[PDB]
Amino acid sequence: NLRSLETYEADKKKQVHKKRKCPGPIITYHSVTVPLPPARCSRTFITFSDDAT
């Protein structure tokens, strides 16, 4: 534990902070490659935070 503390002298925390700053009704455009090089295709998703949007 002492070595860990001395060596600690995170990006995920900054992303969580960015999320905090988000008012809350954030819509995310997300598209990912999915299978049907190997045969595959692209799929699109759109996540809505709250029902208001």
Partner: protein
Amino acid sequence: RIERIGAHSHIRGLGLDDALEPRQASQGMVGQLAARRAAGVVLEMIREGKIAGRAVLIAGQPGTGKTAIAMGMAQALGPDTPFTAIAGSEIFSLEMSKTEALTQAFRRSIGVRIKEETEIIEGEVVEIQIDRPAKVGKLTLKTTEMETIYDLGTKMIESLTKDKVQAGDVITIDKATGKISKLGRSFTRARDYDAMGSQTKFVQCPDGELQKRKEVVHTVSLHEIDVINSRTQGFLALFSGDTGEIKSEVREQINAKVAEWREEGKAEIIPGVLFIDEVHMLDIESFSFLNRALESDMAPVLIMATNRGITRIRGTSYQSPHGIPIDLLDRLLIVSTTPYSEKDTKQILRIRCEEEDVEMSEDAYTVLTRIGLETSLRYAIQLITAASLVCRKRKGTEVQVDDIKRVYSLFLDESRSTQYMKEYQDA
């Protein structure tokens, strides 16, 4: 692909050997070894470009191949070197003086290859998850040998939103400016949407994640002056000829910055050629300008053609050989073109027939060579075309004597036109 064969389409270069020895028939040319060797050596000089302000005058009788050898040199020069072909009567513009048009033509046949270091990131967008507030985003580029995820910024996210980039799109993002350039797609889009059907492009380079020093050579002519003369330049570079810009601070400054670029390694100068066909149409003022304009270091190689002997110079009363003042005529060196013989005429006619994809009998070739030696060569080509058409109409396979002899009476030559012209139609 649909471009019809013209009068000078049969020629496709200047037939020359390793030692510049002219050949009888090659690359669509025939005979005229002296003028062809002169063309070859002046083309070598052009491709060298070490000296500026050299002029050559192609003189000879009509039908000797002046425009032919000019187009042959133009073709042999090949791309990457500008070849500005212009007629003597094109300098007369109602919005720009003759000297201004000549300056434009001179600077238009000079090129500068501008080197530009670029840093482009490319790959396959596996994930373009963007969190729109209505600020946060990440891009997952994939290559055939490595992958990397990049945290996207606000402006980069906005740029990506501008140019719609779905998962699986092959894009080439410039790290310098962030311009979104889509090249294609790597796979279909879910096979479910009843729309947006296209073809899939090949995968990207394995090291496409970050190309460090992609070198792109932007080539532009010295006509870039149009980019400065007015705040809006596209109008002048595309259609507007009213470009009476100020010579001071534009010509001198552009030349100075071009010299600075050449000294600092940014760009390199590539002098082209300016071919003025029927230069005898130039006014004596234009000749006086060429006399001095031909002395600048940025002066291209000025090739000219004249179809006259002793003739009056336009804009004055006294006469000079080739219709050119004694000064400019003496400055340049002249390349005389000797007329073609019967064998050369027959060979040129055969080459033209091969170009037009038309076939005719041996007697047809002989009689047509005779007619061409009598009337002219271009008229012989006109008769070639007419007889080919008459044969096609006749359902024949090749043109016989009875078709050339028929089109000879159907279409008249100037020599026979003036003969039948004795009816004093008008004067």
